[PDB]
């Protein structure tokens, strides 16, 4: 009788995990050029640039 | 407007499984479209989701 | 998956900052069972009729 | 067409299941007889007027 047995049920862990919900693919080419990423390290907290008016 | 679920990620709906009743109905509102997206060749349409069968 | 992973902080501030925790959800797939009622299929019927049984 | 062939089954249950005979359906041509009203063809008729029969 299944119900006089003892039902075990398969037990697991998946390896990967949810990243993220929004789409964060906006840049450079994807936005045409209008939102740029580039990799430029800088010094201190401000990067300033004169120019004539 | 069920589209609208699933927020920017709604481009993952594939297909839409549903009644041949639905279908007529669809077909129905085809034949007697209000304004002009359907003519007496595009009334017929399997894939009328944005493409979605 | 990790809610606040990324947290706005103060370079020129010593300050705590709350410690997170990895949670782990669970998905699950239920089983069905399903079966075929007796079927009455006696050799002698077909055999009268000349039929491979 | 063997009717309710796929039935759910309960594994931790013992009830009785209603037997299902296999049987056969048969389709009929009927056989039409048709004829034609008997048609006069006096040769007289045609003779008169000179005209072969």
């Known amino acids: 009788?299944?119900?006089?047995?003892?039902?075990?049920?398969?037990?697991?862990?998946?390896?990967?995990?949810?990243?993220?919900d929004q789409q964060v693919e906006l840049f450079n080419g994807?936005?045409?050029?209008?939102?740029?990423?580039r990799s430029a390290g800088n010094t201190g907290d401000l990067s300033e640039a004169a120019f004539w008016a | 407007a069920a589209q609208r679920i699933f927020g920017d990620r709604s481009t993952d709906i594939q297909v839409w499984v549903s009644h041949s009743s639905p279908l007529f109905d669809l077909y129905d509102n085809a034949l007697a479209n209000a304004e002009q997206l359907y003519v007496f060749g595009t009334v017929n349409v399997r894939a009328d989701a944005f493409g979605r069968p | 998956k990790i809610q606040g992973l990324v947290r706005p902080?103060?370079?020129?501030?010593?300050?705590?900052v709350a410690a997170k925790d990895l949670r782990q959800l669970v998905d699950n797939t239920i089983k069905v069972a399903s079966g075929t009622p007796p079927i009455?299929?006696?050799?002698?019927?077909?055999?009268?009729?000349?039929?491979?049984?």
């Open chain 1, 1 to 20: 009788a299944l119900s006089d047995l003892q039902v075990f049920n398969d037990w697991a862990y998946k390896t990967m995990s949810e990243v993220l």
């Open chain 3, 40 to 53: 009455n299929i006696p050799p002698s019927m077909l055999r009268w009729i000349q039929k491979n049984p």
């Open chain 3, 9 to 16: 902080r103060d370079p020129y501030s010593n300050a705590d």
């Open chain 1, 30 to 37: 994807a936005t045409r050029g209008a939102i740029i990423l």
